Every structure is written in C-alpha cells, then in structure tokens.
Swiss-Prot record:
Induction: By infection with the periodontal pathogens T.forsythia and F.nucleatum (at protein level). Belongs to the NLRP family. Highly expressed in basal and suprabasal epidermal cell layers with lower levels in dermal fibroblast cells (at protein level). Widely expressed with highest levels in heart, brain and skeletal muscle. Also expressed in liver, colon, dermis and epidermis. Little expression detected in myeloid cells or peripheral blood mononuclear cells. It is found in: Cytoplasm; Cell membrane. Inhibits autoprocessing of CASP1, CASP1-dependent IL1B secretion, PYCARD aggregation and PYCARD-mediated apoptosis but not apoptosis induced by FAS or BID. Displays anti-inflammatory activity. Required for immunity against C.albicans infection. Involved in the innate immune response by contributing to pro-inflammatory cytokine release in response to invasive bacterial infection. Contributes to T-cell-mediated inflammatory responses in the skin. Residues 3-98 form the Pyrin domain. Oligomerizes. Interacts with PYCARD. Also interacts with CASP1 and IL1B. Interacts with NOD1 and components of the NOD1 signaling pathway including RIPK2, NR2C2/TAK1 and IKBKG/NEMO. This is NACHT, LRR and PYD domains-containing protein 10. The pyrin and ATP-binding domains are required to elicit cytokine release following bacterial infection.
Amino acid sequence: GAMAMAKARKPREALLWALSDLEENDFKKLKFYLRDMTLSEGQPPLARGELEGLIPVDLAELLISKYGEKEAVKVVLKGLKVMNLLELVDQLSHICLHDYRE
C-alpha cells in the first residue's frame, strides 16, 4: 500500500522470467515433488536442461497447458517458498496474485 511507482505488468511473462530467475537445480526440485503431487505428470524425467538448455516460455507454456496456467504459476512460488527464493518471487507473487496461495 502506498509508494511504489510501477505501471501495470504482464502476469504470464512474470512466470517465464521468474521460473528462469532461479537455477534449474531449484525449479526442478520443486516441480519434482510439488508438481508430482499437486499435478499429474505431463513432462519428461530428470532434466536440468529443461530450464538451462530450453527456455521458460517453452517449458512454462507446456506446464500451464498441462493442468492449468493458474495452479501452474502457484506451483512455482508455492514450491519456491521452501527454497527461500523470495528474492525474485517477491514481485512475481505480487504479480500473480499471491493471495491465491497460502
């Protein structure tokens, strides 16, 4: 509330830039367990190149389509929390409606 002079941003682009703002050995760790349960598969096995080699707009677009763009973004932050990735998540969350997740 109050302060902060930043125009409107893009939510979808926030997930791509955020998920990429973290190391592959991080996003995968969460998606490995978080997605495993929260979601019902829909991607290849262990692959650190999924983030480093490939791109976020590619892996993200597939994830959002897997179960949904909604829980998709949440699956990133929700699992990123236990990782202490509040650094970049600070905005991403406030840009994807963190209120949706506890």
